[PDB]
């Protein structure tokens, strides 16, 4: 049973600039001290990503519908583990098979099944004033799950569940991709010491898991854990956190490794001409000079066909609209020769009961070259 | 499963016995593309994808890569490279029932051809005329799905063939499936023929001081050649001019 969430104040979506963030390992092949250029689905450098807040202060409970075009980069700034997971699918009404990820304390439970997802799926942690302790209270995400086989297990330990005071201290970076029947989740964790910003620097994104599911995903949600301590449908505390959503596109990136196996730096080839010439030279340092990198060319706007006009017209009107027609035994034949034909002349009137054509059919093939026409 | 609803199963994290298939010889078609047959199929793959369907005998040819037909463009297509095998056998006793069995279906008509791999389960009425028909069977609009109707006394072209199409991804980086033929043998510091993921080669195994990652199996240096493999280093034995 899910409860509709009310007492929410509408506010236009916010956007922020992500700086050289969202670069992962293109393959599972070890490389070191080599400049590798690879084309794959990556987040563009210096792009815009959508920002969603959750501030106690309304309460800014952000969990709308977000598209899944070709992969999603999900960054999460947290200090109390508000975000608990995600759900993926196409309709989220148990009509089509869906997926859900949840960091439950007892076990991580990636469920791939047909769930009757409600309007506002969420989690809720109860707070007790008698003694300092936080425990999971409500879990209102799905109602039915019948047609499926996949279910998983893992071993997480009891986490905090308490809402600490201060600024964000944890950054969780994720990339979800759906290609070749695979749902790849790439993850990284970083300690950050800001208040409300997007962390700088560059960090590699190691592969966490590659689920072999193979389902159709178009729309996805975000799962938040709220806090409680009047009405249950309309009353909740959000807890302070934020998360960033971005979309990957197919781009070519040049990556520079180190003596270790990590990725230390990367550049987007199609960002600016400086990075274009850096990619062209296969180096991160460009000496002074002039370099030919690309080749500009005007793409044709449309296709034009001009042919000779109709000048000789076949006397189908003579045959069809003739005053006198022959008897069946004395079948009359006329040869239609050396004229273009208005094949758009035998059904538009449709006086004819039958325009039943055999082999040629009423189509463009009709309105095409004919060696001889016998009427 | 039927050709339109081509069932897929994942062969993961197990050793495989490709040679029981080769030595069975009862399968009507056991054609393999890219991979070699006659006991050379027992090489490691990242994923072994099995898709099984019951098709007509005459339509077996269309399953091949770059071939065209009704099944190929409306039910099941294969990628042009197709590193894998096509396996078929005649299920006339098992999959033909007296008076015909109509439990197997092929998509006679569809608006467009499919992607290299695609499972269309839609029952939306195919449109052949101006009229929409409101998704009901009328003139110039019929059910896209059409039955087979295998009969016990019928032609070999008209008898059911159970078909398992096996695709083999040759990236080899995960190494989930691997022939149980090789062994470890504790060999190092000698010119030997290394073999760790079904990629054969020659050279001297060497202790490795570099650090890999749990998701990393192979390591390739400059020239995109195998250098380190799950951790052992590959250094070819001494050679030169005389």
């Amino acid at each position, epitope marked *: 049973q899910c409860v509709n969430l009310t007492t929410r104040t509408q506010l236009p979506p916010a956007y922020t600039n992500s700086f050289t963030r969202g670069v992962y390992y293109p393959d599972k092949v070890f490389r070191s001290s080599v400049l590798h250029s690879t084309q794959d689905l990556f987040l563009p450098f210096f792009s815009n990503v959508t920002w969603f807040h959750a501030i106690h202060v309304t309460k800014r409970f952000d969990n709308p519908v977000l598209p899944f075009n070709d992969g999603v980069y999900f960054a999460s700034t947290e200090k109390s583990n508000i975000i608990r997971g995600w759900i993926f699918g196409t309709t989220l009404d148990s009509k089509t098979q869906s997926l859900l990820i949840v960091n439950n304390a007892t076990n991580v439970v990636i469920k791939v099944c047909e769930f009757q997802f409600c309007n506002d799926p969420f989690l809720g942690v109860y707070y007790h004033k008698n003694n300092k302790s936080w425990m999971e209270s409500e879990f209102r995400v799905y109602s039915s799950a019948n047609n499926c086989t996949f279910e998983y297990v893992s071993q997480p330990f009891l986490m905090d569940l308490e809402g600490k005071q201060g600024n964000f201290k944890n950054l969780r970076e994720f990339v979800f991709k759906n290609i070749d029947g695979y749902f790849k989740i790439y993850s990284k964790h970083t300690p950050i010491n800001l208040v409300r910003d997007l962390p700088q620097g560059f960090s590699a994104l190691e592969p966490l898991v590659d689920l072999p599911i193979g389902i159709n995903i178009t729309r996805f949600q975000t799962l938040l854990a709220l806090h409680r301590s009047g009405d249950s449908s309309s009353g909740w505390t959000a807890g302070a956190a934020a998360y960033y959503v971005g979309y990957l596109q197919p781009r070519t990136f040049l990556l520079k490794y180190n003596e270790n196996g990590t990725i230390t730096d990367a550049v987007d080839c199609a960002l600016d001409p400086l990075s274009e010439t850096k990619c062209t030279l296969k180096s991160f340092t460009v000496e002074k000079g002039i370099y030919q990198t690309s080749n500009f060319r005007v793409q044709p706007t449309e296709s034009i066909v001009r042919f000779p006009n109709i000048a000789n017209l076949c006397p189908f009107g003579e045959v069809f609209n003739a005053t006198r027609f022959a008897s069946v035994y004395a079948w009359n034949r006329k040869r239609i020769s050396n004229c273009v034909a208005d094949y758009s002349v035998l059904y538009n009137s449709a006086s004819f009961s039958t325009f039943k054509c055999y082999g040629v059919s009423p189509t463009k093939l009709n309105d095409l070259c004919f060696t001889n026409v016998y009427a | 499963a039927s050709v339109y609803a081509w069932n897929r199963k994942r062969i993961s994290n197990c050793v495989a016995d490709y040679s029981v298939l080769y030595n069975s010889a009862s399968f009507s078609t056991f054609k393999c593309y890219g991979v070699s047959p006659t006991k050379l199929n027992d090489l490691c793959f990242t994923n072994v994808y099995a898709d099984s369907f019951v098709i007509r005998g005459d339509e077996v040819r269309q399953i091949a890569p770059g071939q065209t037909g009704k099944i190929a463009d409306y039910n099941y297509k294969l990628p042009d490279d197709f590193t894998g095998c096509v396996i078929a056998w005649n299920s006339n006793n098992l999959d033909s029932k007296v008076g015909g069995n109509y439990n197997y279906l092929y998509r006679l008509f569809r608006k467009s051809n499919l992607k290299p791999f695609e499972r269309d389960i839609s029952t939306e009425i195919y449109q052949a005329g101006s009229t929409p028909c409101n998704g009901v*069977e009328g003139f110039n609009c019929y059910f896209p799905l059409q039955s087979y109707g295998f009969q016990p006394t019928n032609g070999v072209g008209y008898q059911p063939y159970r078909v398992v199409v096996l695709s083999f991804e040759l990236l080899h980086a995960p190494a989930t499936v691997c022939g149980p033929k090789k062994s470890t043998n504790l060999v190092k510091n000698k010119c030997v023929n290394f073999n760790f993921n079904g990629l054969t080669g020659t050279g001297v195994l060497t202790e490795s001081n570099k650090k890999f990652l749990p998701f990393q199996q192979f390591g390739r240096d400059i020239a995109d050649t195998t250098d380190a493999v799950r951790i052992l280093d590959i250094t070819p034995c001494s050679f030169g001019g005389v």
Partner: antibody, heavy 122, light 106 residues
């Protein structure tokens, strides 16, 4: 081959009913089932069709939202649900066969059941 | 929506002669998607014909269709007393399989 029909229903106005057309072996999977109203002292009206393999039911504009078609793959029985008995809904509903195919484009009613008489009473 | 009008509503009048039952439609029946039906009183209709003229199993070929375009014919070559029954038409062209109003109703 035989599609026996449910008996006459004693339904007070506004009270829902569900008919029980029973398919013989091999009828549902191969062939569609269609419902015709056959209103008293009047003609035949096509309510819709049931595809008993893919569970597809499509209705005419008139009967949309007023009637529900269901069929049971196991036990091979066809069901039609009336939302409530409106006063004009009195009739003799009939269940018949169909082709629902491409190669055979004749979508005619092969075999008709005995019929069910719904009314205010008996 | 293709309406069908049967033209001889009560021409039969306990007929002892060959008949010319008719059906006409607003848009021409495409590809002979028509059928006829035998609704004996107190019983369900029985298929009499499909296509334009294709006969039926267990129905004698004395029942003869003769239609094209606006498909319109059901011809009883030699009339028999038991065959008397309101005869219905039905079109599978575009229409939600609509029927006519019946030609041999008392």
């Amino acid at each position: 081959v035989q599609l026996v029909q449910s008996g006459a229903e004693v339904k007070k106005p506004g009270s829902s009913v569900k008919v029980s057309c029973k398919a013989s072996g091999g009828t549902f999977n191969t062939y569609a089932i269609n419902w015709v109203r056959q209103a008293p002292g009047q003609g035949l009206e096509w309510m819709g069709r049931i595809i008993p393999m893919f569970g597809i039911a499509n209705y005419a504009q008139k009967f949309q939202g007023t009637v529900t078609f269901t069929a049971d793959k196991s036990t091979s029985t066809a069901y039609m649900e009336l939302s409530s008995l409106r006063y004009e809904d009195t009739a003799v509903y009939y269940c018949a066969r169909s082709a629902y195919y491409s190669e055979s484009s004749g979508y005619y009613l092969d075999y008709w059941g005995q019929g069910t008489l719904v009314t205010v009473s008996s | 929506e293709i309406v069908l009008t049967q033209s001889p509503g009560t021409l039969s009048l306990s007929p002892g002669e060959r008949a010319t039952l008719s059906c006409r439609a607003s848009q021409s029946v495409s590809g002979s998607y028509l059928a006829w039906y035998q609704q004996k009183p107190g019983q369900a209709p029985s298929l009499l014909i499909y296509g334009a003229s294709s006969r039926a199993t267990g129905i004698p070929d004395r029942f003869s269709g003769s239609g094209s375009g606006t498909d319109f014919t059901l011809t009883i070559s030699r009339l028999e007393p038991e065959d008397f029954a309101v005869y219905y038409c039905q079109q599978y062209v575009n229409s939600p399989r609509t029927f006519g109003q019946g030609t041999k109703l008392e």
